[PDB]
Amino acid sequence: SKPLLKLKLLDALRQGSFPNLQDLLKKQFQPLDDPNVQQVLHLMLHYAVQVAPMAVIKEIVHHWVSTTNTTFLNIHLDLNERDSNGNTPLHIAAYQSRGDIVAFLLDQPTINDCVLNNSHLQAIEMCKNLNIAQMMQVKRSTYVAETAQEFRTAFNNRDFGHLESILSSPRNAELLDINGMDPETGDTVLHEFVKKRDVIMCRWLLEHGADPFKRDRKGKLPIELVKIAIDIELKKLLERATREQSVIDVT
């Protein structure tokens, strides 16, 4: 069908019945394997934020986005999929100053608001209304705040599973430093946990960034905070870890 597939879909969203949208994809997007269907199908979220009413977006999201609940036509929508122009549905939503939608997108769990398009622009830069930018900028502030507290809590409880959950989220990888000092202490998380001689947690930290060369505010880098067979386990652990970093510096 080539591009009238885009018209079929851009029309189905424009009406506003999520059943009616399914009924179109069910009988008009066959065969689902041919790549012209799968390409215009995976633009569905960019198309919803332009022409579809609000409730159709929620119904599209809460059904097919970042979910393994077998869905419908085995359709799985990536919330941060990228245009031919590199944009995400959050980009278009912002660009068109459709603010009530920029809100609902930033409240989703897998939203990545730090994606760069082809022009090398964040989704926040596309809008024209400052009122929309401010709410966008405010929401990043609240997310980084709430997530940084979940990070601290996860370390204090030694919730290993929750830590791998937070560093996996790419939006977090962009807005979260595993090194940063505690403001009124030394103190990277490596120092804090070398001092509790917690070998299992230090090994975990060494694998997820956490460089062993960062001093605290007393010059002491981690290795210099050292039965006693637990001590020599850390001391040999860091020795092996620093030797890996000094292989990139070939000269």
Binding site: Q149, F151, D177
Partner: peptide
């Protein structure tokens, strides 16, 4: 004290 407990964690694990 200076910083509370959560805004303490924003300075530590936040990236500006």
């Amino acid at each position: 004290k200076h910083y509370n407990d959560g805004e303490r964690a924003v300075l530590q694990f936040g990236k500006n």
